[PDB]
Each structure stands twice: as structure tokens, then as C-alpha cells.
Design a protein around this ligand. Structure first.
Ligand SMILES: *[C@@H]1O[C@H](CO)[C@@H](O)[C@H](O)[C@H]1NC(C)=O
Lengths: 50, 49
């Protein structure tokens, strides 16, 4: 992103409010995803989503 | 979707759908004038490579 290189976070096409401002129009948060249909708390990747 | 407000023409201040930055014509003029240091657009300012 224009701010820079983000590691450990996955991009989300949806739009939530900003919790932790990453910069350049990007914000990150800690999210638990049950949409994966497997393990909710332990998602397939790092739980940080931008 | 329509932009008639009794005759008060806000075209110069409302966003321009026919542009990529979607700035208003007055906003476009202002961004073009103040360009001594800022490039006026962020096409390449994101990475500066
Ligand atoms: C209603 O406003 C529209 C613009 O949205 C304009 O074209 C039209 O002349 C107006 N009609 C009346 C009856 O005010």
C-alpha cells in the first residue's frame, strides 16, 4: 500500500470502521473469522486484518 | 443523481464524475496551483520509486 509493506495482515474487501490506523487509507485490526467454516478463533492465517 | 437545486449551479464545487481523482473543477484548479513541492497527485508518491 502507499503507506508501505504490511506483513501479518490480510486484506478485507469489506469496510469496517478504523481501529488501528495503518495509513494511506488502510486500517488494521484483530479479527476472529468464522466465515472460514473451520476453526473460528484460529483462522488459517495471522489474525491481523487490514 | 440530478444536480438542479433551484438554479444555484454547484458544478464548479461538486465532484466531477468524468475524472479519475473525482475532484471538483475548483478543487482541481486549487490542486494544480499549489504544486511547488507537492506533485498535485499521488500516482507515484506512494512508493517514490
Ligand atoms: C424538479 O427538480 C428537477 C431537478 O431535480 C428539475 O429538473 C425540475 O424542473 C423541478 N420541477 C419542479 C416542478 O420543481
Amino acid at each position: 500500500t502507499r503507506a508501505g509493506c504490511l506483513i501479518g495482515a490480510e486484506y478485507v474487501n469489506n469496510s469496517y470502521e478504523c481501529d488501528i490506523p495503518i495509513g494511506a487509507g488502510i486500517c488494521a485490526s484483530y479479527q476472529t473469522q468464522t466465515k472460514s467454516h473451520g476453526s473460528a478463533s484460529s483462522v488459517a492465517s495471522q489474525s491481523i486484518i487490514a | 443523481p440530478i444536480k438542479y437545486f433551484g438554479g444555484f449551479n454547484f458544478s464548479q464545487i461538486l465532484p466531477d464524475p468524468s475524472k479519475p481523482s473525482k475532484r471538483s473543477p475548483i478543487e482541481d484548479l486549487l490542486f494544480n496551483k499549489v504544486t511547488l513541492a507537492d506533485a498535485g497527485f499521488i500516482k507515484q508518491y506512494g512508493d517514490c520509486l
